[PDB]
């Protein structure tokens with residue numbers, strides 16, 4: 001189990 | 014204009 | 027083709043442990059293997075696959091919902107259209123993001139801020155605003171699905187309570203998405219090589235808990251409303267059965283997809299399954315309307 | 325983070341002209357730039373995007389077509405189901421191909437046949453067989469759409485002629501797809517680093533010309549069948565109008581997409597737009613049935 005990670009500029013899922 | 018190219022093992026489009 | 031190396035004939039050599047040499051800001055060698063690179067590309071391709079599924083499903087649901095929805099000018103129809111158009115537009119901007127200079131392996135391997143064009147920053151911001159509007163439209167639909175369904179129930183005390191809680195959750199998630207958006211925008215505009223995902227996780231769990239709350243209310247209510255119809259009358263196949271089926275689907279599949287998105291291995295590009303969960307939570311209602319009309323017509 | 329290199333501070337350096345060093349069968353250096361690599365990854369992502377659109381649109385069209393198609397046990401319904409299930413299964417196998425070891429940049433840069441697993445060859449063959457069955461189902465539908473629509477016309481001479489030509493084209497495309505499939509299978513099974521696309525181009529143009537022929541027939545006929553209804557009666561908004569609209573869409577959009585797929589720049593991954601053209605040629609008929617029922621019911 002993990003927190004969702006955003007790449008350094010990934011827009012919102 | 015060009016012929017469609019299949020990579021060396023691309024399955025059929 | 028000067029000459030095939032010896033390793034073309036060796037049947038034991040695997041390309042996956044071989045090393046790529048390239049230049050990066052941190053150093054000069056910065057060796058990386060083809061399997062980290064193929065992990066990156068597979069994550070990008072997996073995100074593209076799910077967003078293609080979103081775009082095609084939402085576009086064809088929008089098209090079908092026009093062709094058949096006889097009840098035009100209803101607020102729930104207009105909201106469902108706004109939400110499907112926002113899903114399509116969000117998927118379109120994301121489809122530019124996956125083919126831009128922020129999802130490229132050029133930036134994911136070489137953290138060079140010179141490669142970044144300010145138009146990509148504007149695309150990032152537009153995508154975040156469109157996501158905020160999408161969550162706003164979804165919660166508008168839900169507050170409009172609980173407000174309307176709670177009209178006519180003699181036990182209006184608890185109906186008003188349920189509307190209130192749902193509307194509180196809707197405002198909380200919309201405000202948290204907007205706070206996350208602006209806290210990501212100021213950092214991205216200031217420094218292109220940083221992110222603020224702290225509030226993201228909170229806003230997505232807020233949206234998932236809202237959807238879970240809705241599926242609870244609709245299933246509880248419809249259960250007492252087919253138990254009252256089973257003690258007097260019978261409940262095995264009426265349109266009643268179609269709403270109950272779609273509300274049990276909304277109860278079980280998006281929660282399963284949310285836990286699947288939070289449980290699987292990280293960095294594999296599977297983290298955007300929360301968008302398939304929101305896609306199905308959206309598509310439960312128009313498909314419910316289609317089945318309801320196509321079982322009422324006969 | 326030992327120390328940021330000088331090129332982090334230079335605002336003129338672009339990563340796109342920088343060179344990747346890696347090992348390959350042909351040589352030892354084999355330099356390649358990040359922009360050829362990002363072209364490869366963007367082509368893979370573009371193929372994934374269109375196949376995600378195909379999978380989502382076909383799956384939701386299959387689901388909706390059940391929920392609403394009251395005329396079950398019709399041959400055209402069963403064919404439309406077989407075709408939507410084959411589109412979904414083809415998209416699924418392709419979604420494995422894009423995440424396999426033949427679409428990986430590991431093989432597209434280092435032509436190592438050792439990386440190839442024989443299961444991927446079997447997946448390739450299964451995808452080719454499923455494509456052959458898909459073309460067979462599409463042409464079965466079309467020969468079943470011209471056979472049925474030509475029943476009842478007083479001018480049955482030309483109707484039988486049209487059925488015959490269409491059925492000849494259907495058999496020719498199915499046989500050419502099967503010949504292309506087997507001629508690709510023997511080469512892939514023999515040598516994993518070769519392809520036989522010579523018959524591909526011919527079979528796709530045969531399918532496009534079949535679809536073009538169908539849209540001609542259905543539009544010509546429906547034009548004379550609304551001109552006979554305009555000299556006596558009027559033709560501005562009846563279900564007649566819905567079939568004519570979908571047949572003009574089938575006339576104009578898949579041909580435009582076929583020429584767009586044959587005209588745009590090569591090696592950009594846009595060559596799979598022919599599958600969006602076939603997707604829309606498939607989705608014209610179930611959506612036509614939905615609109616026809618939802619304009620006949622009132």
Ligand SMILES: CC(C)CCC[C@@H](C)[C@H]1CC[C@H]2[C@@H]3CC=C4C[C@@H](OC(=O)CCC(=O)O)CC[C@]4(C)[C@H]3CC[C@]12C
Nearest residue numbers: 001002003004227231234235236238281282284285288
């Ligand atoms: C049931 C529906 C409403 C979806 C919510 C499911 C929850 C049970 C999930 C969502 C987020 C999950 C958490 C996300 C991150 C982590 C990683 C990890 O976190 C830690 O405490 C250590 C690492 C860190 O400090 O982040 C251990 C599990 C945990 C807390 C997860 C536990 C299970 C949680 C609370």
Ligand SMILES: CC(C)CCC[C@@H](C)[C@H]1CC[C@H]2[C@@H]3CC=C4C[C@@H](OC(=O)CCC(=O)O)CC[C@]4(C)[C@H]3CC[C@]12C
Nearest residue numbers: 014015016017525529532533534536579580582583586
């Ligand atoms: C209208 C519907 C039924 C779609 C068919 C459109 C045609 C007008 C397209 C399909 C294939 C095309 C051809 C595909 C390949 C080429 C590339 C090129 O071929 C050459 O003669 C030189 C290169 C080579 O030898 O292949 C010049 C255009 C041409 C013949 C294209 C001309 C236009 C064609 C016939």
Ligand SMILES: CC(C)CCC[C@@H](C)[C@H]1CC[C@H]2[C@@H]3CC=C4C[C@@H](OC(=O)CCC(=O)O)CC[C@]4(C)[C@H]3CC[C@]12C
Nearest residue numbers: 081085088089111114117118119121122123125126127
């Ligand atoms: C409401 C329904 C009926 C619309 C159905 C069609 C749309 C979903 C299509 C039509 C135009 C398409 C767009 C046309 C062009 C592009 C640009 C494309 O990116 C690029 O061309 C590269 C950009 C870069 O270099 O970064 C990304 C997909 C996108 C937004 C497409 C997404 C899908 C769109 C919106």
Ligand SMILES: CC(C)CCC[C@@H](C)[C@H]1CC[C@H]2[C@@H]3CC=C4C[C@@H](OC(=O)CCC(=O)O)CC[C@]4(C)[C@H]3CC[C@]12C
Nearest residue numbers: 111112114115116118119122126143144145146148149
């Ligand atoms: C609501 C549904 C029906 C979709 C509607 C389509 C729009 C969402 C698409 C169609 C064309 C797209 C545009 C096509 C090209 C560009 C240029 C592009 O310029 C850049 O900054 C990148 C340039 C580059 O690639 O080098 C920015 C996005 C934008 C405005 C796109 C934004 C999204 C647009 C308006």
Ligand SMILES: CC(C)CCC[C@@H](C)[C@H]1CC[C@H]2[C@@H]3CC=C4C[C@@H](OC(=O)CCC(=O)O)CC[C@]4(C)[C@H]3CC[C@]12C
Nearest residue numbers: 003195224225226227228229230231232235236238239
């Ligand atoms: C469904 C109905 C009956 C309401 C249930 C109670 C809610 C008000 C609870 C249930 C889950 C809770 C959420 C579970 C987890 C989080 C994440 C938490 O932030 C983090 O953990 C992110 C940072 C990190 O830990 O890495 C902020 C509160 C929040 C949104 C919680 C807010 C309050 C929520 C929505």
Ligand SMILES: CC(C)CCC[C@@H](C)[C@H]1CC[C@H]2[C@@H]3CC=C4C[C@@H](OC(=O)CCC(=O)O)CC[C@]4(C)[C@H]3CC[C@]12C
Nearest residue numbers: 275279280282283286287290291296299302306313387
């Ligand atoms: C009710 C109708 C309208 C829709 C039904 C759709 C379901 C059949 C879908 C929705 C979510 C899907 C799931 C979403 C994600 C995954 C994870 C996917 O990948 C893994 O489990 C990873 C395995 C690994 O680690 O290698 C396998 C399929 C599965 C369970 C999917 C199976 C099919 C599901 C249940």
Ligand SMILES: CC(C)CCC[C@@H](C)[C@H]1CC[C@H]2[C@@H]3CC=C4C[C@@H](OC(=O)CCC(=O)O)CC[C@]4(C)[C@H]3CC[C@]12C
Nearest residue numbers: 068072075076079083294296302379380383384419423
């Ligand atoms: C019409 C729609 C609404 C029906 C529902 C379809 C989805 C539930 C499907 C369509 C695409 C599927 C995904 C396609 C590919 C993958 C990647 C797969 O993992 C890998 O391939 C990674 C392998 C590696 O680590 O190299 C895990 C399942 C997943 C996310 C699938 C999960 C289920 C998805 C989201």
Ligand SMILES: CC(C)CCC[C@@H](C)[C@H]1CC[C@H]2[C@@H]3CC=C4C[C@@H](OC(=O)CCC(=O)O)CC[C@]4(C)[C@H]3CC[C@]12C
Nearest residue numbers: 379380383384387412413415416417419420423424425
């Ligand atoms: C209701 C159904 C008939 C239509 C709507 C849902 C389907 C489109 C979904 C449900 C299950 C999904 C599948 C579940 C798991 C996988 C395995 C997955 O495998 C990998 O990605 C492996 C990659 C690797 O091994 O490297 C590829 C997608 C696929 C076939 C999914 C494709 C999309 C599927 C068929």
Ligand SMILES: CC(C)CCC[C@@H](C)[C@H]1CC[C@H]2[C@@H]3CC=C4C[C@@H](OC(=O)CCC(=O)O)CC[C@]4(C)[C@H]3CC[C@]12C
Nearest residue numbers: 409410412413414416417420424441442443444446447
């Ligand atoms: C018609 C719609 C509803 C989709 C039906 C699902 C099937 C298309 C999927 C479900 C699980 C898939 C299988 C899951 C795993 C594998 C193992 C896989 O093994 C390999 O050769 C690759 C191993 C590796 O990744 O290293 C080959 C494909 C196969 C049989 C897949 C083929 C496609 C299957 C049968």
Ligand SMILES: CC(C)CCC[C@@H](C)[C@H]1CC[C@H]2[C@@H]3CC=C4C[C@@H](OC(=O)CCC(=O)O)CC[C@]4(C)[C@H]3CC[C@]12C
Nearest residue numbers: 016522523524525526527528529530531533534536537
């Ligand atoms: C639409 C109705 C009225 C019928 C029209 C006549 C058809 C029988 C013609 C029109 C286009 C023709 C096709 C145009 C181009 C080709 C490609 C040709 O092969 C190649 O050019 C591939 C190799 C190469 O040139 O690189 C084989 C014949 C074929 C399928 C032709 C077969 C005969 C077709 C289908």
Ligand SMILES: CC(C)CCC[C@@H](C)[C@H]1CC[C@H]2[C@@H]3CC=C4C[C@@H](OC(=O)CCC(=O)O)CC[C@]4(C)[C@H]3CC[C@]12C
Nearest residue numbers: 085089573577580581584585588589592594597600604
């Ligand atoms: C049933 C209805 C809703 C279908 C609507 C489909 C159209 C809106 C789509 C189908 C194919 C699309 C086209 C497919 C590919 C491209 C190429 C794309 O990129 C380029 O032109 C490349 C430029 C470059 O070389 O840099 C621009 C959009 C365009 C014309 C797309 C515009 C929108 C189109 C016509």
Ligand SMILES: CC(C)CCC[C@@H](C)[C@H]1CC[C@H]2[C@@H]3CC=C4C[C@@H](OC(=O)CCC(=O)O)CC[C@]4(C)[C@H]3CC[C@]12C
Nearest residue numbers: 082085086125363366367370373374377381592594600
């Ligand atoms: C089924 C209906 C309801 C929707 C139909 C939507 C399609 C017409 C869209 C969806 C995905 C789109 C494609 C997404 C991405 C691209 C890549 C784009 O080129 C680039 O991104 C720049 C060049 C490069 O990246 O190499 C050109 C348009 C194209 C093929 C788009 C053409 C229009 C497509 C096929």
Ligand SMILES: *[C@@H]1O[C@H](CO)[C@@H](O)[C@H](O)[C@H]1NC(C)=O
Nearest residue numbers: 047055057345346347352353
């Ligand atoms: C890549 O870099 C390492 C360390 O600098 C070096 O030992 C290796 O020889 C390089 N790879 C090739 C193919 O030259």
Ligand SMILES: *[C@@H]1O[C@H](CO)[C@@H](O)[C@H](O)[C@H]1NC(C)=O
Nearest residue numbers: 049053054055328329330331
């Ligand atoms: C990086 O390695 C190459 C190989 O010798 C060398 O020419 C170059 O000077 C190195 N870059 C720096 C900043 O030292």
Ligand SMILES: *[C@@H]1O[C@H](CO)[C@@H](O)[C@H](O)[C@H]1NC(C)=O
Nearest residue numbers: 047048054055343345353355
């Ligand atoms: C990479 O290949 C080039 C050949 O163009 C060579 O000059 C260089 O020394 C190699 N290593 C690096 C880090 O560039």
Ligand SMILES: *[C@@H]1O[C@H](CO)[C@@H](O)[C@H](O)[C@H]1NC(C)=O
Nearest residue numbers: 030031032033347351352353
């Ligand atoms: C490839 O380049 C490296 C760098 O010196 C060298 O060690 C290696 O021997 C070379 N491979 C062959 C087959 O010469």
